[PDB]
Every structure is written in structure tokens, then in C-alpha cells.
Symmetry: C2
Subunit: 139 residues, 2 copies
Amino acid sequence: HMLLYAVGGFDGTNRLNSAECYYRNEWRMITAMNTIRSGAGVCVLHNCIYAAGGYDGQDQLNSVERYDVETETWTFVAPMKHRRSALGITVHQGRIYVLGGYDGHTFLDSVECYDPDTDTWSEVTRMTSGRSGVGVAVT
Amino acid sequence: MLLYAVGGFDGTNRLNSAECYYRNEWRMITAMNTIRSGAGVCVLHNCIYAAGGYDGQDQLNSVERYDVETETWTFVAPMKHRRSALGITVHQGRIYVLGGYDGHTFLDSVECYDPDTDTWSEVTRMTSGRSGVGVAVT
């Protein structure tokens, strides 16, 4: 926890796969992701930035990639069971939790859980109703 | 130790409701004061903050805070800019919101919330106005 990262997004004309980091003031670019992602789930787990799902301008994404700060390289990990944009994301006890989102036809209520050690995504529970754009909090 | 799902959009209505997962059971808690979809939601100290979002007609700049002890939502200082599809993170006891959509412009503004002084301040600007960004601190 020292540097702020801005990952992907949408500028009103193009959706972004680029990422910048704030330091000298100034936002400087880092290595761009392998996939154009807007509205992705972005979190930090074991000093790696994870980027899950999102919208590339045509399709809802299920791919997940992680950025290694030491190698400055984005790498794909196991993809989610569901494509989703406008998902909520949180990290709890060394695992990534994604909640809801939109798969292209359905507002999901699925909640998937990522185990980094085994590189698996597994559904852990389901919200009371399918919905997207949710905020997630653990306290 | 509890998971909270705040607001959202079920495909027909935007939601101001919130629920907590315990006994493998999702249980509803006190609903928010403002209908919020795609708001910035984080945990500062031990309170849930919900900043901005879309209520169905307008983009929101209001910020309310849920106290787990008192089970109530309280409005705090509003952001200088209305924002939907904003990024949000907590870092050294402060909230950072990044970009988003204000109803006409994709924002490059970054605001910082100090809970002690209840103030938002514009810290810097991103290289370009943008929305739907993921924020990470590491």
C-alpha cells in the first residue's frame, strides 16, 4: 500500500486497457492490460492488482488478469464462471469476492469466490435478487 | 467479518436497499436515504460509505455513512462533483474517488475525503476524463 493506480475505464469515445499510477505529482503510465476493460472489478491481493470482468465496448468479459508490480507484467488467471460488467468486488481473508453484475442478458445474483492458491473460481452464495452496480463492503 | 451489498440495479428499479450476509442467510438491513446504483462504496474505520451513484434520473454527489452500531445511515459532506461509475478506495484513513460521469462530462477529477474534518478536497487530476475505472492501492 503506497501508490494509487487508475485501471482501465471509458473516456466517452474509447474504452481503456491502459493503467496509470500516481506518484513528483504527475500520473505516469504503467504496462497496459491485455484486455480493454471498463467497469471492471479491481482489487489488491498479495501485492497484486486484479482486474476482473468489465466491458470492452462489445462484449461483457469473464477474463481475469493480475498485475505483478515487481515484474510489471499483466497475466491472465482463471476466468470467472460468469461474464459480468458493473460488478462489485472485495477482498476478504485472502480471497476475491465478486457480487452480481450484468452478463449481457441477465442481472446476476451469483457471488463467485477466487482462491489464489488453487486458481479456482467457485460460487459461494447468491444474493436475494439479481442486480448490478452494487457496492460491496466488509466490516 | 460481514459482507454487505449496498444499492444496485435489479434490471427495472434502482435500489436504495442494503443487505448483509451472515447461518448461510442474506438478511436485509436499514435502507439507504438515497437511491444509489453504481456508487462508490468502501469501509472507512468501521463505517460503510456510499458516495455518488445514479438514482435513475440524476447523478449523485451526496455521501451517506452507515454505522453498524447505530444501524442508521447519515449524510456527510457531499463531493464537489456528481459522479456515477466512479472508482473508490481507502488509503491512510481517507477516501479517494476517481473520475466517473456527471451527466454530461467524463470526469478527470480526483477527490479526497477526510473524515476528521468532514471535507472533500480536489487532490489532483487524471491524465484524461474517464469513467468506469478500477482503483487500487499497493
